[PDB]
RNA sequence: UGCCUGGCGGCCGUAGCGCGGUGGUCCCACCUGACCCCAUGCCGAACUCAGAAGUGAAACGCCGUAGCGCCGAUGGUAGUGUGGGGUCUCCCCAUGCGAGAGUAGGGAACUGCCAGGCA
RNA sequence: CCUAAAGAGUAACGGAGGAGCACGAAGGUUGGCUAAUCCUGGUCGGACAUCAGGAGGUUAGUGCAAUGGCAUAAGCCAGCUUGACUGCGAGCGUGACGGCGCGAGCAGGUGCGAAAGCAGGUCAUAGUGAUCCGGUGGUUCUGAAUGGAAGGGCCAUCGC
């Protein structure tokens, strides 16, 4: 016999690149993600692939806001 | 419900203005009255305000909930804003169509000298 | 006009005593009367619905909305976005004017009429009925129609129970059996 | 022979069988057969033990089977060497210490003990007779 | 692989073109879009032509 | 100063549904018209405008009530880092970390800015 | 997608599925809107068509697998449109490399919006192929004595 499986795709190296309290330059990618597991907070942008990036220098801060308990990432200007 | 449906309409723009960090000119409109507030970027600090519930403005008017009243409140809020010295604001229609009374208020505020 | 003044100046007081309401706003009001021509045979020939719409236009005196299919159904051979009917909503003046022509003129002219049913209620006091022929109304003529077509009528009311709904309609002398 | 009517997947990782059981109380009947050992019970073993148990009570009272064989086991044919996971041959329930396997009601304890003794001889796992507690 | 490549040519007569694809069966009519012509540095009408 | 109402934030179900009671001077809501500004893939329902006869019914707000949702200890248990051990498919011991579920119990929110009415 | 051991990565002729496109709107923007399913009543009409109300609360939808997302909707509808722009790009992710990806902001010119603003294609992740040789258009480059031209370069693009 044989197998009909045997396929996979390359790993995409998603996930958090800069954790809480880390100092980042503007432009720095904070998280790579499929869809917005995290949402952009203050001084953070969301790219077309839902990458969150710093729009300003400062420290990364994770926070849960709203009734749904959504995870936001923001940059505390420092 | 109507109010909840309007809060929904207002959220996108409000969240956006919060992100930009703009001084808002928030308008509220009822069948009988129309209100106006210049709220600071932080969002928990009213700088100036005006309304047809205020007797200073209401005494001069025929009816409080019409275009002509809105025009008056628009002039009122703008003058008080320029007194403190604000000028640059962003209009927040707060879920109401930019039309009729809301438009009238906004037009009057521009003509008065607010920059939007 | 006729039934509107008839409601305000008579029917209000009757129901104020009957059910013993406190406020006048607690009294039931006829919110809207909705028509419906569920033309499901227009999938082959669309002209059937166009002619049906023209008939419904004359009856109500208002432009009909062409309703679409909500989902695809294999049993009836329909796909989503196919026109399979047309409704009309009536509020204010055109509501009463139609309600006038319904009760007095149209209902008696039904072929082999033996009173309308009084069991047709949903639970929240909203009546329904099934008109068999469209020619019962004065606007439509017997000779001019190409094919006979029935239609549905639904009378939405600001009611809570069925007894309050039938009591409201009974005040307008609605043919019951 | 007990077996899921359908499954999302045909084949399952071997996995492991650590921990103590859930469902350690006599919940339905008055008397239970409880696993003291750890292992796998095949559908055939569950059936063989059921039959012995049922016959012993002469189809009097009621018997619950608390365990269900929902784990598919594959095997490779003879004289095969790789070339993909084997075919599903049978089904098992994973048993941990404390699992109540069977319950019984509407018989004397004396008869229940006998029936469960006959059932236990069909099972690869060490068992113990247990009774319903008030709390 | 049905959509054919086309070029949109500038109406400014610069010879500047954009390329895109087009389903020629479904949409036989010629594509026509105002696009930025960098040679004249103006938004001008671009019209479809053969690749 | 206090009470009530509106608007904008802070705080995310101990803040939600239900059940019982309660408010119309102002405010808010429904409500009254619609030729118009504007609007319906039909409809002044909504949107919108011009109004203020009626109404606190619905909605909205406020007060009570564990009836739910929900929150939730303590202890124990599961798991587990390091070291050691056994009867080693799985466990135990020393030490550190320690759930989930459940139990007692709770729960009928809290707070700044501006404006208006009332005493 | 799982194996994958709660950062990334991670093998087997391990366990399961998909791609080799589509779309000038299915892109942009402004304004608006909110699902499935069931219950009750109703011409033809039936288990299921369309109408009304209630419960429900996204159990729907998303151009195509699966996963992660989506109500401020990323879902649905309409108006006007071509930003599916040109030159660039602080900074960052990911690769042995060739490469691949995210990107605020700057200049020019544009669309939508009263305006704040948003727009360098599409909810995101597949839809692909180096170099050489050659073709087409452009070009303030080169042009074997000189002027030209051929040929070459550069920019855009195509083919097997
Ligand atoms: C039976 S386990 C040994 C490897 C197997 N023959 C495959 S190929
Ligand atoms: K579009
Ligand atoms: K559009
Ligand atoms: Mg993967
Ligand atoms: Mg494991
Ligand atoms: Mg504890
Ligand atoms: Mg706990
Ligand atoms: Mg990992
Ligand atoms: Mg790990
Ligand atoms: Mg390795
Ligand atoms: Mg799209
Ligand atoms: Mg020469
Ligand atoms: Mg020469």
TrEMBL record, chain C:
Keywords: Acetylation, Ribonucleoprotein, Ribosomal protein, RNA-binding, rRNA-binding, tRNA-binding. Residues 23-79 form the Large ribosomal subunit protein uL5 N-terminal domain. InterPro entries: Ribosomal_uL5, Ribosomal_uL5_bac-type, Ribosomal_uL5_C, Ribosomal_uL5_CS, Ribosomal_uL5_dom_sf, Ribosomal_uL5_N. GO terms for biological process: translation. It holds the Pfam family Ribosomal_L5_C. It comes from the Bacteria. The modification N6-acetyllysine is found at residue 2. The keyword Nucleotide-binding does not apply. Residues 83-176 form the Large ribosomal subunit protein uL5 C-terminal domain. One of its GO terms (molecular function) is structural constituent of ribosome. One of its GO terms (cellular component) is ribonucleoprotein complex. Belongs to the universal ribosomal protein uL5 family. Part of the 50S ribosomal subunit; part of the 5S rRNA/L5/L18/L25 subcomplex. Contacts the 5S rRNA and the P site tRNA. Forms a bridge to the 30S subunit in the 70S ribosome. This is 1 of the proteins that bind and probably mediate the attachment of the 5S RNA into the large ribosomal subunit, where it forms part of the central protuberance. In the 70S ribosome it contacts protein S13 of the 30S subunit (bridge B1b), connecting the 2 subunits; this bridge is implicated in subunit movement. Contacts the P site tRNA; the 5S rRNA and some of its associated proteins might help stabilize positioning of ribosome-bound tRNAs. This is Large ribosomal subunit protein uL5. It comes from Escherichia coli O145:NM.
UniProtKB/TrEMBL annotation, chain E:
One of its GO terms (biological process) is translation. Keywords: Ribonucleoprotein, Ribosomal protein. Pfam families: Ribosomal_L33. GO terms for cellular component: cytosolic large ribosomal subunit. One of its GO terms (molecular function) is structural constituent of ribosome. PROSITE patterns: RIBOSOMAL_L33 (PS00582). The keyword Ribonucleoprotein applies. Belongs to the bacterial ribosomal protein bL33 family. This is Large ribosomal subunit protein bL33.
């Amino acid at each position: 016999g044989s197998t009909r499986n045997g396929r996979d795709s390359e790993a995409k190296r998603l996930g958090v690149k800069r954790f809480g309290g880390e100092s980042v330059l503007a432009g720095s990618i904070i998280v790579r993600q499929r869809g917005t597991k995290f949402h952009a907070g203050a001084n953070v942008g969301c790219g077309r692939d839902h990458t969150l990036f710093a729009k300003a220098d400062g420290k990364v801060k994770f926070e849960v806001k709203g009734p749904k308990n959504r995870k936001f990432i923001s940059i505390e200007a420092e | 419900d109507k109010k909840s449906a309007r809060i929904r309409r207002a959220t996108r723009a409000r969240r956006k203005l919060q992100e930009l960090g703009a001084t808002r000119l928030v308008v509220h409109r009822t069948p009988r009255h129309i209100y106006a507030q210049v709220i600071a970027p932080n969002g928990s600090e009213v700088l100036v305000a005006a309304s047809t519930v205020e007797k200073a403005i209401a005494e001069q008017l025929k009816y409080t909930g019409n275009k002509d009243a809105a025009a008056a409140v628009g002039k009122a809020v703008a003058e008080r804003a320029l007194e403190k010295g604000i000028k640059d604001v962003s209009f927040d229609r707060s879920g109401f169509q930019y039309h009729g009374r809301v438009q009238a208020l906004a037009d009057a505020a521009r003509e008065a000298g607010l920059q939007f | 006009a006729k039934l509107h003044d008839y409601y305000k100046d008579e029917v209000v007081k009757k129901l104020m005593t009957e059910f013993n309401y406190n406020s006048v706003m607690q009294v039931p009001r006829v919110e809207k009367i909705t028509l419906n021509m569920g033309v499901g045979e227009a999938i082959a020939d669309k002209k059937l619905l166009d002619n049906a719409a023209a008939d419904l236009a004359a009856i109500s005196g208002q432009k009909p909305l062409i309703t679409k299919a909500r989902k695809s159904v294999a049993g009836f051979k329909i796909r989503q976005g196919y026109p399979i009917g047309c409704k009309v909503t009536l509020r204010g003046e055109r509501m009463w004017e139609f309600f006038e022509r319904l009760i007095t003129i149209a209902v008696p002219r039904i072929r082999d009429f033996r009173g309308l049913s009084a069991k047709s209620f949903d639970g929240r006091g909203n009546y329904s009925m099934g008109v068999r022929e469209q020619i019962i109304f004065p606007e439509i003529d017997y000779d001019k129609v190409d094919r006979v077509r029935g239609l549905d009528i639904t009378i939405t009311t600001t009611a809570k129970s069925d007894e309050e709904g039938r009591a409201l309609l009974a005040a307008f002398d609605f043919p019951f059996r | 022979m007990l077996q899921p009517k359908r499954t999302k997947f045909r084949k399952m990782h071997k996995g492991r069988n650590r921990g103590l059981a859930q469902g350690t109380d006599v919940s339905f009947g008055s008397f239970g057969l409880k696993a003291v050992g750890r292992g796998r019970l095949t559908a055939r073993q569950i059936e063989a033990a059921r039959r012995a148990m049922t016959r012993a009570v002469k189809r009097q009272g009621k018997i619950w089977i608390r365990v269900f064989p929902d784990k598919p086991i594959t095997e490779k044919p003879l004289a095969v060497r790789g070339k993909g996971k084997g075919n599903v041959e049978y089904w098992v329930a994973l048993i941990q210490p404390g699992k109540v396997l069977y319950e019984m009601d509407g018989v004397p304890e004396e008869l229940a003990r006998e029936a469960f003794k006959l059932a236990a001889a069909k099972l690869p796992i060490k068992t113990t007779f247990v009774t319903k507690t008030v709390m | 692989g049905i959509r054919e490549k086309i070029k949109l040519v500038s109406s400014a007569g610069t010879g500047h073109f954009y390329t895109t694809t087009k389903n020629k069966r479904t949409k036989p009519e010629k594509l026509e879009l105002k696009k930025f012509d960098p040679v004249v540095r103006q938004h001008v009408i671009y019209k479809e032509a053969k690749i």
